[PDB]
Every structure is written in C-alpha cells, then in structure tokens.
C-alpha cells in the first residue's frame, strides 16, 4: 500500500528528537501505553483473531491525515480496536459508549490482499536481484524506495514465514517464504541525493527476481 506510512526517503522533516544516550524516560510515559501491545498479543495468541501482519496493515489503513497527527502508541490503540470490530468481536458502538465519546477507526481495506506468489527463485549469497516492479494496494513489506531497484544478496534466512501480502489480510494462502537481506548502494536508491553508503532491506522471496 503506497500510504503515508512509507516514509523512508521523504524530504522536509526536521531533526530527530534525540541526541545520543540522552534520557528517554520510562518505557511507558502514560498509564495506558502498555495496552495496545498487550491487547495485540491477546488478539494474536489468546483469541487467535488476527495476525501481527494484520496489525501492521490496519495501522497503514488509518486515514492519512489521522496517521500523521497520531502518536505511535495511540495508532495501535486505534488499530487493535479496528481489528476487534472488523473481526466481529467488538462493536464501535460499545467502544464509544465505554469511551464516553468518539472513537474513529482505521478505514476499510480496499484490497483483498494477494497469495504467496507461485513462481519464485531461491537466491544465493552474492547474486544480483531486482525488486519486482509491482504495485500492491493492500499490505506489502517492500518500502517503495527499493521497487524496481537492483541489489546483491547478503543473506538468505534459514527460516520461512507467511507472505505478508496474504497473512496481513487474514488469507489462507500465505504459504511460507524465506527472506533475503538485499544490499543496495545508496546511489541506486537516491542518486546523488544521499550521504550514505548502502542500505540493506529484508525482502521476501516473492518480492524479488533475478537481475
């Protein structure tokens, strides 16, 4: 999904609000902040109602201006609540009654997702690969800066996982694929307009093709 959440490479932001080893304060800075992760794991591990990938996608589905003005942990309150309503476990009515006020949720998905691709290749370390020039309106774990670009394999994982573009939609056809550490030169991703050296993206097999 080419949403505002795909922020790498966006220009115009100011300083990162940190200097090295500065005080970051407690793990939680308000008494509710442990609830989004905790209730995510209840949903995943206790209710079996959704996957972690579906949490990433529902946060991607926040209305874009809503995403941009909402603090991190509140985005996950909104996302987990949205999933609980979408999966039939809760209603928005009861959430607003308990909350005492409006509780707008993420927007409905505009894609049913897609299966794990049928034809892929097992790549070896050192091989050159290109990121498939594909547009996916639902969930995908490919930041757009690497779409269509060429890099080299640094690592093939020794484990496999369900394809995000399927399991992020709760589909039954996510299969399993390894992922690859793909090293891109900074100039391949941003031309002259970078001060970096290389960028390594961890890309599912189904996002890649031989160069």
Partner 1 sequence: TENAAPAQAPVSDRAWALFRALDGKGLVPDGYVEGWKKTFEEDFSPRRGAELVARAWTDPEFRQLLLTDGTAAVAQYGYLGPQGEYIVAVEDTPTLKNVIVCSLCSCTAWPILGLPPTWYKSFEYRARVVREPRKVLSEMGTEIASDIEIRVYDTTAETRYMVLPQRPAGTEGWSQEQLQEIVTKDCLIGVAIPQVP
Residues taking part in catalysis: 56, 72, 76
126 forms part of the interface with partner 1 (CB under 8 A): no
3-state secondary structure of 82: helix
67 forms part of the interface with Mg ion (CB under 5 A): no
* Mode of pairing for the β-strands spanning 128-131 and 208-210: antiparallel
Q: For residue 205, what are its two tokens? A: 């097999």
C-beta of 42: minimal distance to Mg ion in Å?
32
Q: For residue 112, what are its two tokens? A: 């049913």
46 forms part of the interface with partner 1 (CB under 8 A): yes
Binding region for partner 1 (CB under 8 A) out of 114-122, 124-132, 135-143, 165-173: 135-143
192 forms part of the interface with partner 1 (CB under 8 A): no
User: Which of partner 1, Mg ion, none does residue 144 bind (CB under 5 to 8 Å by kind)?
Assistant: Mg ion
136 with 114: CB under 8 angstroms? yes
34 forms part of the interface with partner 1 (CB under 8 A): yes
C-beta of 106: minimal distance to partner 1 in Å?
12
Gap between the Cα atoms of 205 and 151, Å rounded: 14
Query: Under rule CB under 8 A, how many of the chain's residues touch partner 1?
Result: 89
User: Which of partner 1, Mg ion, none does residue 145 bind (CB under 5 to 8 Å by kind)?
Assistant: partner 1
Q: Which residues between 144 and 163 bind partner 1 (CB under 8 A)?
A: 145, 155, 157, 159, 161
144 forms part of the interface with Mg ion (CB under 5 A): yes
Gap between the Cα atoms of 207 and 174, Å rounded: 14
Task: Give every CB contact of residue 154 below 8 A, 6+ residues apart in sequence.
Answer: 125, 180, 181, 182, 183, 200
Gap between the Cα atoms of 44 and 51, Å rounded: 6
6 forms part of the interface with Mg ion (CB under 5 A): yes
C-alpha 2 chain-centroid distance: 11
Q: Which residues between 160 and 179 bind partner 1 (CB under 8 A)?
A: 161, 164, 179
Gap between the Cα atoms of 11 and 22, Å rounded: 25
Query: What string marks each residue from 63 to 82 as x (binds partner 1 by CB under 8 A) or -?
Result: x-xx-xx-xx-x--xx-xx-
131 with 84: CB under 8 angstroms? no
Chain residues in the site for Mg ion (CB under 5 A): 2, 6, 144
């Amino acid at each position: 999904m080419d949403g505002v959440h795909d922020l790498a490479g966006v220009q115009g932001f100011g300083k990162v609000p940190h200097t090295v080893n500065a005080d970051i304060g407690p793990t939680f800075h308000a008494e509710w902040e442990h609830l989004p992760y905790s209730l995510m794991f209840a949903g995943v591990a206790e209710l079996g109602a959704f996957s972690v990938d579906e949490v990433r996608y529902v946060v991607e589905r926040m209305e874009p201006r809503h995403y941009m003005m909402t603090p991190y942990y509140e985005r996950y309150v909104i996302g987990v609540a949205t999933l609980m309503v979408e999966k039939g476990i809760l209603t928005q009515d009861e959430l607003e009654s308990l909350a005492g006020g409006p509780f707008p949720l993420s927007r409905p998905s505009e894609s049913e997702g897609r299966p794990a691709p049928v034809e892929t290749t097992t790549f070896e370390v050192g091989q050159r690969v290109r990121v498939r020039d594909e547009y996916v309106p639902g969930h995908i774990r490919m930041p757009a800066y690497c779409r269509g670009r060429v890099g080299t394999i640094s690592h093939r994982t020794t484990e496999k996982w369900p394809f995000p573009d399927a399991i992020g939609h709760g589909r039954n056809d996510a299969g399993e694929e390894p992922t690859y550490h793909v090293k891109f030169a900074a100039e391949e991703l941003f031309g002259s307009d970078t001060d970096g050296g290389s960028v390594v993206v961890d890309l599912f097999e189904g996002y890649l093709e031989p160069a």
